[PDB]
C-alpha cells in the first residue's frame, strides 16, 4: 500500500497535515495523520499560538470543525479579506486539515516528521510532503486504504 501526505511544518508545536487532497481532503484521511503524529484536532488555542509565532500556509485548513484560514495579521493577502478563521466561500470539494501535536512544544520546528509514531505497523508509504519545503518517505499504516492500489473487484453500475 502507499499513500501521499502534504503537511506545512510543525510551527511552536502546530503542524498542518493533508492527504494528496489539496483542496480535497477529508477528514477522514486527514484527521488520521493529524492523530498519526501525536496531535489534536485544530483547535483555537493550538492556531492562535502558531498564528502569533509566525506560522501559516495560506491554504485552506480545516479547523476545530471547519474549513478556516490562519491570518492573525490585519494586512488581508493570503486568503481573501476576512482575517483569522477565515471560513471558505466557494465551490464544494475539500479542504487540508490542522493539528497541534504534542511532539514538539510551543516552538517552530520543519524537521522531517516522516515519523507519525502514533499509527501502526504496515507497507504503507508514508511519504510527508512539507508544502514545499522538503518531502520525507516512510512505512507504517493509519489510512488503512489499502484499495486504492490494488483494487478487489471494480464497480460498474451505469451503462
Same mark, same amino acid.
Do not use: W
Given at each position: ?9 510543525r ?23 493529524c492523530?498519526?503524529?501525536n ?9 492562535e ?7 501559516e500556509?495560506c $491554504?485552506? %485548513? ?9 491570518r492573525?495579521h #490585519?494586512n488581508s !493577502?493570503?486568503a481573501? &479579506? ?7 466561500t ?23 516528521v ?13 511519504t510527508?510532503?512539507? $508544502?514545499d %519545503? ?7 499504516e493509519?489510512?488503512t486504504? #489499502?484499495?486504492? !492500489?490494488?483494487?478487489? &473487484?471494480?464497480?460498474d453500475?451505469?451503462?
Amino acid at each position: 500500500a502507499q499513500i501521499d501526505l502534504n503537511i506545512t511544518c510543525r510551527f511552536a508545536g502546530v503542524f498542518h497535515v493533508e492527504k494528496n487532497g489539496r483542496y480535497s481532503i477529508s477528514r477522514t484521511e486527514a484527521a488520521d495523520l493529524c492523530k498519526a503524529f501525536n496531535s489534536t484536532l485544530p483547535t483555537m488555542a493550538q492556531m492562535e499560538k502558531a498564528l502569533s509565532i509566525g506560522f501559516e500556509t495560506c $491554504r485552506y %485548513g480545516f479547523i476545530e470543525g471547519h474549513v478556516v484560514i490562519p491570518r492573525i495579521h #490585519p494586512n488581508s !493577502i493570503c486568503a481573501a &479579506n476576512n482575517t483569522g478563521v477565515y471560513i471558505l466561500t466557494s465551490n464544494t470539494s475539500q479542504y487540508d486539515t490542522y493539528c497541534f501535536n504534542a511532539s514538539a512544544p510551543p516552538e517552530e520546528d520543519c524537521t522531517s516528521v516522516t515519523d507519525l509514531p502514533n499509527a501502526f505497523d504496515g507497507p504503507i508509504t508514508i511519504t510527508i510532503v512539507n $508544502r514545499d %519545503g522538503t518531502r520525507y518517505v516512510q512505512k507504517g499504516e493509519y489510512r488503512t486504504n #489499502p484499495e486504492d !492500489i490494488y483494487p478487489s &473487484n471494480p464497480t460498474d453500475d451505469d451503462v
